[PDB]
Amino acid sequence: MDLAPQMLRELQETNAALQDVRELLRQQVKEITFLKNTVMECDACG
Amino acid sequence: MDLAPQMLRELQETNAALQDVRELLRQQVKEITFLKNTVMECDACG
Amino acid sequence: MDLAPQMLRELQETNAALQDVRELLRQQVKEITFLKNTVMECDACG
Amino acid sequence: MDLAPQMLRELQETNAALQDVRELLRQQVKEITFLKNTVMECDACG
Amino acid sequence: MDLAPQMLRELQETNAALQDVRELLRQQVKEITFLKNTVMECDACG
Numbered sequence A, B, C, D, E: 001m002d003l004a005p006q007m008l009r010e011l012q013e014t015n016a017a018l019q020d021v022r023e024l025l026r027q028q029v030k031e032i033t034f035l036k037n038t039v040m041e042c043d044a045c046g
C-alpha cells in the first residue's frame, strides 16, 4: 500500500546490478582461463 | 491494483541471473584450482 | 491467482542460490591465498 | 502489510550492498588483467 | 493476514548473505592485489 511502486523500483535496480555482476564475472572467467593456459604453457615450468 | 505481477517478474529475472552467477563462480574456482596445481608443479619454483 | 506465495518461493530460491555463492567464494578465497603463498615461495621469483 | 516500510529498507540495503560488490568486482577484473599481462611479458614463460 | 513476515525474513537473510559475499570479495581483492605485486617483482620475468 503506497510504497509498492517504491519496492518495484528497488527490485528493477537489483536486477540491473545483477546483470552487471554477471558480465563482470563472464569477463573474469575468460581472463582466468587465459592465465591458466599461459602458465600451463610456461617453459620454465618443465 | 497491486504490482505483484511486475515484482514477481523482476524476482524471476533476478533468480535467472543468480543461477548463471553461481555457474560462473563454480567454473572459476575450477580454473583457479587448476592454476594452483600447475604452479605447485612448476619446476622453476622448487 | 494471488501471487504472494510464488514471490515467497522466488525469494527462497534467491537465498538458496546465494548460500551456494557464499560457499564457492569461500573456497575460492582459500585457493587464491594458497596460490599466493605458493608464488611467494617460487624460487625463480622474488 | 504494516511491514512494508521495513521491507523497503531491506530492499534498499540489498542494492547498497550490491553496488559495493559491483565496485569490488570491477577493480578485481582490473587486477586480474594486470596479472595476466604480467605473465605474458614474463621472460621465463611465453 | 499476509506472507510479509515470511517475506521480511527472506529479505533479511539475503542481506546477511550479501554482507558475507562483500566481505569475502574484499579479502579476495586483497590477496589478488598482493599476488599481482609479488609477480611484479618475480626475478625470472626479466
Ligand SMILES: [Cl-]
Residues within 6 Å of the ligand: none
Ligand atoms: Cl570472484
